[PDB]
Subunit: 142 residues, 4 copies
């Protein structure tokens, strides 16, 4: 049975809606195991300003909260309880997505292109890197 990785930005509503049907259809093929991953971004820029368990809340705290929101989001998908798993990481979202894709390993990554906006973007920062560097199939959802 295949493995599908579904990266979720917990701050995105519309994106999460569009991937739901795709994720559901994809898992109904092969009875796939679906792994959801949300990544707490860590910015060098903020570090360089001095903003660190100090001016920013504890990482253990942030993770529990992110994980909490991810599990709320996973309830929006019709997937067998036995086939789903939630993951939280910290770092560059693209690197951690790609790392998780190597770790599982993933047969497919399902990822939204970019938040809907009035800019003329192609792919988002993270979608483009995943598409480019993943070693498995990537479904870019629009």
């Amino acid at each position: 049975n295949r493995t599908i990785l579904v990266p979720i930005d917990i701050s995105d509503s519309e994106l999460t809606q569009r991937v739901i049907s795709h994720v559901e259809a994809e898992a109904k093929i092969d009875d796939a195991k679906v792994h959801f991953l949300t990544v707490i971004p860590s910015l060098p820029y903020y570090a360089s300003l001095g903003l660190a368990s100090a001016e920013l809340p504890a990482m253990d705290d942030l993770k529990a909260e992110a994980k909490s929101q991810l599990e709320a989001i996973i309830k929006k998908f019709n997937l067998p309880a036995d086939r789903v798993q939630a993951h939280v990481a910290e770092g560059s979202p693209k690197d951690k997505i790609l790392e998780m894709a190597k770790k599982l390993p993933a047969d497919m990554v399902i990822i939204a292109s970019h938040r809907p906006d009035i800019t003329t973007y192609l792919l988002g920062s993270n979608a483009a890197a995943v598409v480019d560097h993943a070693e498995c199939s990537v479904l870019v959802v629009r």
Copy 2:
């Protein structure tokens, strides 16, 4: 529902992986699958005095030759005859693909990342452009 599957006739030995994705996606819905091959037309060759119906063959004969090869490829897929259509175009492959996706319109484009090649998991020129510019979901198959 409409799936567009671009085919480069010089990669006739498709992976089971690509065939499998298309068959599976088509089964999810009652989807029509449109296959498209594009005869590339190069300004560089025009600049060298290589013109259609002169030192290159007539475009119509090239179209028929391409379409004939596409039809042999289409049959590799286990799809009902009434849910499959063959298209041949000429020009810039990325732009004709994107044009077709817009015309139909496609709900999904299924495209191989790159011909099997041990050097890279990176996208080829057409895959990269299609993933970037399609207005619909794009599955990049590896």
Copy 3:
């Protein structure tokens, strides 16, 4: 006389070193005006965790600090005092870089590709978007 935009991530040392010579050579042509821009990233993800002049320091504060570090960095370039200007913004670095490129308007953007790392990146998140969407020439420094 032309206008050159030089985006600076204040947390990057190596990148800033490599662009120095390019920026200097480029400005010696045309006696260009050189505008430096550093952008305080604002992350939806952090907002969605609750982290806002509250759990994160005042934006006025962050800006003064970023601007301070930018001016320290601008001292590493041999440019006429009359030809340089420092800017700070807040938001998506790529959007604000691109906006500044439209606002000046910029004749050239000089931007490092990506921090040197042992990952096999092509361009960074922001370099790629600038390259892709800027309406002027872009010098991608490596």
Copy 4:
């Protein structure tokens, strides 16, 4: 110092902007400027039974024709004869460019984004690949 300037002979009417960038970059240093044109070789055409020295002309004659056109283009640049070299290759233009950049090696590649075209400021297929994969600095001219 070595500058590589890829030339597509079917865009012979270069912008003053491209010529200006190359001249200026070469003057900064005492730089040698290598110009390269690549005769594209398409698997798709091979698949249609179009082979060199049969239904296409001999590669040597195509090489000589291309080189002759390149040399006329090279002369548009105001460069000293001893700091300029012409190269013709055959195959995938993006890969031969990148190969040349590696071989020389190039300290900089100067490349137009795309032929002048009112539809887009986005990169063409070769420019995009070259900016992404060159190991050296790349100036994308618009």
